[PDB]
Structure 1
Amino acid sequence: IYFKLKKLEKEYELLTLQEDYIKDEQRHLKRELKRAQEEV
């Protein structure tokens, strides 16, 4: 009731930290895309 919901907070804060890693890499990744389909 007061210890279980402490857990559910921190698993969320885990999740949000990776929701940006999956994102920003795409922002970092696409710069290789045209960088490569230009070299072609």
Structure 2
Amino acid sequence: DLYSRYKKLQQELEFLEVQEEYIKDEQKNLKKEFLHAQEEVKRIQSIPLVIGQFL
């Protein structure tokens, strides 16, 4: 069906492209979160560093 099957090829590609878009803004969001994590990695610490020894 050239006036059905072919046309139906867009019935889902719109949401396809919308999610392909949203993966980018979510890359952005997860990057924000990863930067937050890396921030929290070493900000309280290394000031009162007590010393023991590995065994």
The alignment's TM-score, normalised by the length of structure 1, stands at 0.76
Q: List runs of 5+ in structure 1 lacking aligned partners.
A: none
Would you tell me which structure has more helix in proportion to its own residues?
A: 1
Runs of 4+ in 1 over 6 A off after TM superposition: none
The alignment's TM-score, normalised by the length of structure 2, stands at 0.61
Larger Rg: 2
Root-mean-square deviation (CA, aligned residues, Å) is: 1.1
Would you tell me which structure has more strand in proportion to its own residues?
A: 2
* Number of equivalent positions: 40
